Protein backbone atom coordinates (compact mmCIF):
# COMPACT_ATOMS: atom_id res chain seq x y z
CA UNK A 1 0.00 0.00 0.00
CA UNK A 2 0.90 3.69 -0.17
CA UNK A 3 0.25 4.34 3.53
CA UNK A 4 -0.41 2.19 6.60
CA UNK A 5 -1.59 2.84 10.16
CA UNK A 6 -0.80 1.23 13.49
CA UNK A 7 -2.33 1.53 16.97
CA UNK A 8 -0.73 0.65 20.29
CA UNK A 9 -1.89 0.26 23.88
CA UNK A 10 -0.19 -1.66 26.70
CA UNK A 11 -0.30 -1.73 30.50
CA UNK A 12 2.53 -2.69 32.84
CA UNK A 13 5.40 -6.59 41.96
CA UNK A 14 8.17 -7.38 44.45
CA UNK A 15 7.98 -10.75 46.26
CA UNK A 16 6.09 -13.81 45.00
CA UNK A 17 6.07 -17.06 46.98
CA UNK A 18 5.47 -19.95 44.61
CA UNK A 19 4.10 -23.34 45.47
CA UNK A 20 2.09 -25.72 43.26
CA UNK A 21 1.68 -27.71 36.31
CA UNK A 22 0.77 -24.15 37.37
CA UNK A 23 1.74 -21.64 40.09
CA UNK A 24 -0.47 -20.96 43.16
CA UNK A 25 1.72 -18.01 44.19
CA UNK A 26 0.75 -15.73 47.11
CA UNK A 27 2.13 -12.27 47.94
CA UNK A 28 1.40 -9.01 49.74
CA UNK A 29 -0.70 -6.46 47.81
CA UNK A 30 -1.50 -2.84 48.64
CA UNK A 31 -4.96 -1.30 49.04
CA UNK A 32 -6.87 0.87 51.54
CA UNK A 33 -5.21 3.78 53.36
CA UNK A 34 -1.53 3.74 52.44
CA UNK A 35 -0.65 1.15 55.14
CA UNK A 36 -2.78 -2.00 55.30
CA UNK A 37 -1.74 -4.54 52.64
CA UNK A 38 -4.09 -7.47 52.09
CA UNK A 39 -2.08 -10.50 50.95
CA UNK A 40 -3.64 -11.63 47.67
CA UNK A 41 -3.12 -14.57 45.30
CA UNK A 42 -2.96 -14.99 41.54
CA UNK A 43 -1.22 -17.47 39.21
CA UNK A 44 1.71 -17.45 36.82
CA UNK A 45 3.25 -19.60 34.11
CA UNK A 46 6.87 -20.42 34.93
CA UNK A 47 7.76 -18.35 31.86
CA UNK A 48 6.27 -15.26 33.52
CA UNK A 49 8.28 -15.48 36.78
CA UNK A 50 12.01 -15.04 37.39
CA UNK A 51 14.05 -16.77 40.15
CA UNK A 52 16.12 -15.03 42.80
CA UNK A 53 17.62 -15.89 46.20
CA UNK A 54 13.39 -21.28 51.11
CA UNK A 55 11.91 -20.54 47.68
CA UNK A 56 10.87 -16.99 46.78
CA UNK A 57 10.62 -15.66 43.21
CA UNK A 58 9.67 -12.35 41.61
CA UNK A 59 8.43 -10.84 38.35
CA UNK A 60 10.77 -10.70 35.37
CA UNK A 61 10.11 -6.45 29.21
CA UNK A 62 10.58 -3.23 31.14
CA UNK A 63 9.41 -0.12 29.29
CA UNK A 64 5.78 0.33 28.28
CA UNK A 65 5.89 3.12 25.68
CA UNK A 66 7.75 0.85 23.27
CA UNK A 67 5.54 -2.10 24.24
CA UNK A 68 2.46 -0.32 22.89
CA UNK A 69 4.11 1.73 20.13
CA UNK A 70 5.84 -1.45 18.94
CA UNK A 71 2.37 -3.01 18.76
CA UNK A 72 1.33 0.08 16.77
CA UNK A 73 4.07 -0.07 14.10
CA UNK A 74 3.85 -3.85 13.88
CA UNK A 75 0.06 -3.61 13.88
CA UNK A 76 0.41 -1.60 10.65
CA UNK A 77 2.35 -3.89 8.30
CA UNK A 78 0.12 -6.91 9.07
CA UNK A 79 2.63 -9.01 11.00
CA UNK A 80 0.91 -9.62 14.34
CA UNK A 81 15.27 -11.55 23.79
CA UNK A 82 12.74 -9.80 26.04
CA UNK A 83 15.35 -7.83 28.02
CA UNK A 84 15.68 -5.02 25.43
CA UNK A 85 12.75 -3.03 24.05
CA UNK A 86 15.15 -1.09 21.83
CA UNK A 87 16.13 -4.26 19.96
CA UNK A 88 12.56 -5.44 19.38
CA UNK A 89 11.90 -1.99 17.89
CA UNK A 90 14.84 -2.20 15.48
CA UNK A 91 13.35 -5.64 14.77
CA UNK A 92 9.93 -4.20 13.93
CA UNK A 93 11.56 -1.46 11.87
CA UNK A 94 13.53 -4.24 10.13
CA UNK A 95 10.33 -5.95 8.97
CA UNK A 96 8.68 -2.72 7.82
CA UNK A 97 11.80 -1.47 6.05
CA UNK A 98 11.97 -4.91 4.42
CA UNK A 99 8.46 -4.16 3.13
CA UNK A 100 9.18 -0.60 1.96
CA UNK A 101 6.98 1.48 4.28
CA UNK A 102 9.04 4.36 5.66
CA UNK A 103 7.67 5.43 9.04
CA UNK A 104 5.50 8.51 8.62
CA UNK A 105 4.78 10.12 11.98
CA UNK A 106 4.80 8.68 15.51
CA UNK A 107 3.01 10.27 18.47
CA UNK A 108 3.68 9.53 22.14
CA UNK A 109 1.17 9.63 24.98
CA UNK A 110 13.42 13.18 29.91
CA UNK A 111 11.12 13.43 26.89
CA UNK A 112 14.02 14.55 24.70
CA UNK A 113 16.08 11.61 25.98
CA UNK A 114 13.26 9.16 25.21
CA UNK A 115 12.62 10.47 21.69
CA UNK A 116 16.33 10.30 20.86
CA UNK A 117 16.24 6.75 22.20
CA UNK A 118 13.51 5.98 19.65
CA UNK A 119 15.08 7.91 16.78
CA UNK A 120 18.15 5.70 17.26
CA UNK A 121 16.06 2.57 16.61
CA UNK A 122 14.04 4.12 13.76
CA UNK A 123 16.68 6.56 12.43
CA UNK A 124 13.62 8.80 12.03
CA UNK A 125 13.35 12.54 12.78
CA UNK A 126 13.36 14.32 16.13
CA UNK A 127 10.72 16.73 14.75
CA UNK A 128 8.51 13.68 14.14
CA UNK A 129 8.39 12.33 17.71
CA UNK A 130 6.95 13.74 20.92
CA UNK A 131 1.84 3.03 34.25
CA UNK A 132 -0.11 3.09 30.98
CA UNK A 133 0.69 3.84 27.36
CA UNK A 134 -1.37 4.38 24.25
CA UNK A 135 0.73 5.15 21.19
CA UNK A 136 0.25 5.54 17.44
CA UNK A 137 2.62 5.01 14.51
CA UNK A 138 1.95 6.09 10.92
CA UNK A 139 3.65 4.41 7.97
CA UNK A 140 4.33 6.17 4.67
CA UNK A 141 5.69 4.85 1.38
CA UNK A 142 9.11 6.08 0.30
Amino acid at each position, epitope marked *: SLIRIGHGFDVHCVTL*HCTNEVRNCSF*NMTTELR*D*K*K*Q*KVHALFYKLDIVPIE*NSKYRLIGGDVALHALTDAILGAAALGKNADSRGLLREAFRQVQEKGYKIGNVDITHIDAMRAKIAEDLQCDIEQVNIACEAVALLIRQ
Partner: antibody
Amino acid sequence: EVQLVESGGGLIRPGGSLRLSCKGSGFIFENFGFGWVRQGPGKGLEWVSGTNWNGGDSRYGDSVKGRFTISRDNSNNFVYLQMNSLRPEDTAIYYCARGTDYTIDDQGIRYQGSGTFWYFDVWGRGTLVTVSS
Amino acid sequence: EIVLTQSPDTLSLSPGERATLSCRASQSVHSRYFAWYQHKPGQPPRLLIYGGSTRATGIPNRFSAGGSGTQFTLTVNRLEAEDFAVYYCQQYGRSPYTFGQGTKVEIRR
Protein backbone atom coordinates in the same frame (compact mmCIF):
# COMPACT_ATOMS: atom_id res chain seq x y z
CA GLU B 1 -15.59 -22.95 66.46
CA VAL B 2 -11.92 -22.23 67.07
CA GLN B 3 -10.06 -25.18 68.58
CA LEU B 4 -6.51 -26.55 68.72
CA VAL B 5 -5.86 -30.28 69.14
CA GLU B 6 -2.39 -31.44 70.17
CA SER B 7 -1.00 -34.96 69.83
CA GLY B 8 2.22 -36.94 70.16
CA GLY B 9 2.75 -36.99 73.93
CA GLY B 10 4.45 -39.68 75.98
CA LEU B 11 7.48 -40.83 77.96
CA ILE B 12 10.92 -40.53 76.34
CA ARG B 13 14.40 -40.99 77.77
CA PRO B 14 17.01 -38.21 77.89
CA GLY B 15 18.54 -37.76 74.46
CA GLY B 16 15.44 -39.10 72.72
CA SER B 17 13.25 -37.35 70.17
CA LEU B 18 9.54 -36.66 69.96
CA ARG B 19 7.16 -35.03 67.49
CA LEU B 20 4.15 -32.91 68.44
CA SER B 21 1.26 -31.97 66.16
CA CYS B 22 -1.38 -29.25 66.49
CA LYS B 23 -4.46 -29.12 64.25
CA GLY B 24 -6.31 -25.83 63.86
CA SER B 25 -9.90 -25.45 62.74
CA GLY B 26 -12.58 -22.83 62.25
CA PHE B 27 -10.47 -20.06 60.69
CA ILE B 28 -8.24 -19.40 57.71
CA PHE B 29 -5.25 -21.36 58.99
CA GLU B 30 -2.79 -20.18 56.32
CA ASN B 31 -2.91 -16.56 57.58
CA PHE B 32 -1.79 -17.11 61.18
CA GLY B 33 1.45 -17.53 63.03
CA PHE B 34 1.78 -20.14 65.75
CA GLY B 35 3.86 -20.70 68.85
CA TRP B 36 4.47 -23.18 71.64
CA VAL B 37 4.50 -22.53 75.39
CA ARG B 38 5.37 -24.95 78.18
CA GLN B 39 4.95 -25.06 81.95
CA GLY B 40 7.41 -27.08 83.98
CA PRO B 41 6.55 -28.46 87.40
CA GLY B 42 5.93 -25.48 89.68
CA LYS B 43 7.02 -22.96 87.03
CA GLY B 44 5.18 -20.30 85.09
CA LEU B 45 4.75 -19.91 81.36
CA GLU B 46 7.99 -19.96 79.39
CA TRP B 47 8.23 -18.86 75.76
CA VAL B 48 9.74 -21.70 73.70
CA SER B 49 9.30 -20.90 70.02
CA GLY B 50 7.29 -19.21 67.31
CA THR B 51 6.94 -19.33 63.54
CA ASN B 52 5.09 -17.26 60.96
CA TRP B 53 2.52 -18.34 58.39
CA ASN B 54 4.87 -20.20 56.02
CA GLY B 55 7.47 -21.28 58.55
CA GLY B 56 10.08 -19.14 56.82
CA ASP B 57 10.81 -17.15 60.00
CA SER B 58 11.33 -19.43 63.00
CA ARG B 59 12.98 -18.36 66.25
CA TYR B 60 13.51 -19.79 69.68
CA GLY B 61 13.93 -19.00 73.33
CA ASP B 62 17.55 -18.68 74.40
CA SER B 63 17.13 -21.75 76.63
CA VAL B 64 15.95 -23.97 73.74
CA LYS B 65 18.11 -22.72 70.86
CA GLY B 66 19.56 -25.63 68.90
CA ARG B 67 17.70 -28.60 70.37
CA PHE B 68 14.19 -27.64 69.21
CA THR B 69 13.02 -27.29 65.62
CA ILE B 70 9.61 -25.89 64.63
CA SER B 71 7.94 -26.66 61.31
CA ARG B 72 4.51 -26.37 59.71
CA ASP B 73 2.58 -28.03 56.87
CA ASN B 74 0.25 -25.50 55.24
CA SER B 75 -0.81 -28.16 52.71
CA ASN B 76 -2.57 -30.33 55.31
CA ASN B 77 -3.15 -27.49 57.83
CA PHE B 78 -0.82 -28.92 60.48
CA VAL B 79 1.87 -27.29 62.58
CA TYR B 80 4.59 -29.40 64.19
CA LEU B 81 7.27 -29.19 66.86
CA GLN B 82 10.22 -31.53 66.36
CA MET B 83 11.99 -31.79 69.73
CA ASN B 84 15.47 -33.33 69.65
CA SER B 85 18.02 -33.92 72.41
CA LEU B 86 15.29 -33.82 75.05
CA ARG B 87 16.44 -33.36 78.65
CA PRO B 88 14.72 -33.85 82.03
CA GLU B 89 14.46 -30.09 82.68
CA ASP B 90 12.29 -29.87 79.55
CA THR B 91 9.63 -31.93 81.35
CA ALA B 92 6.45 -29.86 81.21
CA ILE B 93 2.94 -29.50 79.81
CA TYR B 94 3.19 -28.10 76.28
CA TYR B 95 0.42 -25.88 74.88
CA CYS B 96 -0.09 -25.11 71.21
CA ALA B 97 -1.26 -21.55 70.71
CA ARG B 98 -2.42 -19.42 67.80
CA GLY B 99 -0.58 -16.17 67.14
CA THR B 100 -1.70 -13.03 65.33
CA ASP B 101 -3.04 -12.57 61.80
CA TYR B 102 -0.95 -9.50 61.02
CA THR B 103 2.54 -8.11 61.45
CA ILE B 104 4.40 -4.82 61.14
CA ASP B 105 7.73 -4.13 59.46
CA ASP B 106 10.44 -1.63 60.38
CA GLN B 107 8.58 0.92 58.21
CA GLY B 108 5.39 0.74 60.28
CA ILE B 109 3.38 -0.96 57.52
CA ARG B 110 0.75 -3.42 58.75
CA TYR B 111 0.33 -6.71 56.86
CA GLN B 112 -3.09 -8.27 57.37
CA GLY B 113 -3.15 -12.05 57.12
CA SER B 114 0.62 -12.55 57.47
CA GLY B 115 0.32 -13.72 61.03
CA THR B 116 3.11 -14.12 63.54
CA PHE B 117 3.61 -15.08 67.17
CA TRP B 118 3.79 -11.94 69.32
CA TYR B 119 0.97 -13.12 71.59
CA PHE B 120 -1.55 -15.94 71.75
CA ASP B 121 -5.33 -15.51 71.71
CA VAL B 122 -6.20 -19.23 71.40
CA TRP B 123 -4.66 -21.99 73.51
CA GLY B 124 -4.96 -25.75 73.29
CA ARG B 125 -6.03 -27.89 76.21
CA GLY B 126 -2.39 -29.02 76.38
CA THR B 127 -0.53 -32.30 76.07
CA LEU B 128 1.80 -33.64 78.75
CA VAL B 129 5.42 -34.40 77.92
CA THR B 130 7.54 -36.03 80.63
CA VAL B 131 11.29 -36.36 80.11
CA SER B 132 12.90 -38.67 82.66
CA SER B 133 15.06 -41.79 82.65
CA GLU C 1 17.37 -12.10 76.88
CA ILE C 2 14.63 -9.99 78.49
CA VAL C 3 14.02 -10.86 82.14
CA LEU C 4 10.56 -10.07 83.54
CA THR C 5 10.07 -9.59 87.29
CA GLN C 6 6.45 -9.33 88.48
CA SER C 7 4.97 -8.14 91.75
CA PRO C 8 3.45 -8.88 94.08
CA ASP C 9 3.91 -12.63 93.67
CA THR C 10 0.24 -13.08 94.64
CA LEU C 11 -2.72 -11.08 95.92
CA SER C 12 -5.20 -11.54 98.76
CA LEU C 13 -8.33 -9.58 97.80
CA SER C 14 -12.12 -9.79 98.14
CA PRO C 15 -14.93 -9.61 95.56
CA GLY C 16 -15.83 -6.09 94.49
CA GLU C 17 -12.35 -4.65 95.05
CA ARG C 18 -9.92 -3.26 92.50
CA ALA C 19 -6.72 -5.21 91.85
CA THR C 20 -3.50 -3.57 90.64
CA LEU C 21 -0.80 -5.79 89.13
CA SER C 22 2.87 -5.02 88.45
CA CYS C 23 5.44 -6.28 85.93
CA ARG C 24 8.96 -4.83 85.75
CA ALA C 25 10.93 -5.17 82.51
CA SER C 26 14.72 -5.28 82.40
CA GLN C 27 15.07 -3.31 79.15
CA SER C 28 12.82 -0.82 77.38
CA VAL C 29 9.69 -2.20 75.71
CA HIS C 30 7.57 0.00 73.44
CA SER C 31 4.45 0.27 75.63
CA ARG C 32 2.26 -1.21 72.88
CA TYR C 33 4.24 -4.47 72.72
CA PHE C 34 2.96 -6.01 75.95
CA ALA C 35 0.37 -8.71 76.65
CA TRP C 36 -1.38 -10.14 79.70
CA TYR C 37 -2.94 -13.59 80.18
CA GLN C 38 -5.32 -15.26 82.63
CA HIS C 39 -5.01 -18.87 83.78
CA LYS C 40 -7.17 -20.85 86.21
CA PRO C 41 -5.99 -24.24 87.52
CA GLY C 42 -7.35 -26.96 85.26
CA GLN C 43 -8.07 -24.72 82.26
CA PRO C 44 -6.03 -23.42 79.32
CA PRO C 45 -4.79 -19.83 79.60
CA ARG C 46 -6.87 -17.15 77.88
CA LEU C 47 -5.53 -13.96 76.34
CA LEU C 48 -6.73 -10.77 78.03
CA ILE C 49 -4.66 -7.92 76.59
CA TYR C 50 -2.44 -7.23 73.61
CA GLY C 51 -1.12 -3.95 72.26
CA GLY C 52 -0.70 -2.63 75.79
CA SER C 53 -4.42 -2.09 76.30
CA THR C 54 -6.22 -3.03 73.09
CA ARG C 55 -8.82 -5.42 74.44
CA ALA C 56 -8.47 -9.01 73.27
CA THR C 57 -11.51 -10.70 71.78
CA GLY C 58 -14.11 -11.37 74.47
CA ILE C 59 -12.38 -9.31 77.17
CA PRO C 60 -14.70 -6.80 78.90
CA ASN C 61 -13.92 -3.12 79.37
CA ARG C 62 -13.67 -3.83 83.11
CA PHE C 63 -10.01 -4.78 82.52
CA SER C 64 -7.43 -2.08 81.80
CA ALA C 65 -3.64 -1.98 81.63
CA GLY C 66 -0.84 0.42 80.84
CA GLY C 67 2.64 1.61 81.69
CA SER C 68 5.81 2.34 79.80
CA GLY C 69 9.58 2.05 79.92
CA THR C 70 10.51 -0.62 82.46
CA GLN C 71 7.30 -0.83 84.54
CA PHE C 72 3.83 -1.89 83.39
CA THR C 73 0.67 -2.36 85.44
CA LEU C 74 -2.70 -4.05 85.00
CA THR C 75 -5.80 -2.89 86.87
CA VAL C 76 -9.09 -4.76 87.33
CA ASN C 77 -11.73 -2.26 88.41
CA ARG C 78 -13.99 -4.64 90.37
CA LEU C 79 -13.05 -8.29 90.86
CA GLU C 80 -15.73 -10.96 90.47
CA ALA C 81 -15.74 -14.61 91.51
CA GLU C 82 -14.58 -15.96 88.14
CA ASP C 83 -11.56 -13.63 88.27
CA PHE C 84 -9.61 -15.48 90.98
CA ALA C 85 -6.77 -17.17 89.10
CA VAL C 86 -3.12 -16.66 88.05
CA TYR C 87 -2.11 -13.77 85.79
CA TYR C 88 1.04 -13.46 83.68
CA CYS C 89 2.61 -10.52 81.88
CA GLN C 90 4.35 -10.99 78.54
CA GLN C 91 6.77 -8.83 76.57
CA TYR C 92 7.39 -9.14 72.83
CA GLY C 93 9.74 -6.23 72.24
CA ARG C 94 12.84 -8.36 71.68
CA SER C 95 13.56 -12.04 71.08
CA PRO C 96 13.56 -14.21 73.05
CA TYR C 97 10.05 -13.22 74.08
CA THR C 98 9.65 -13.86 77.79
CA PHE C 99 6.92 -14.15 80.42
CA GLY C 100 6.81 -12.88 83.95
CA GLN C 101 6.61 -15.48 86.69
CA GLY C 102 2.92 -14.88 87.42
CA THR C 103 0.87 -13.29 90.18
CA LYS C 104 -1.93 -15.29 91.81
CA VAL C 105 -5.21 -13.71 92.91
CA GLU C 106 -6.83 -15.77 95.67
CA ILE C 107 -9.94 -15.70 97.84
CA ARG C 108 -9.48 -13.80 101.09
CA ARG C 109 -10.89 -15.27 104.28
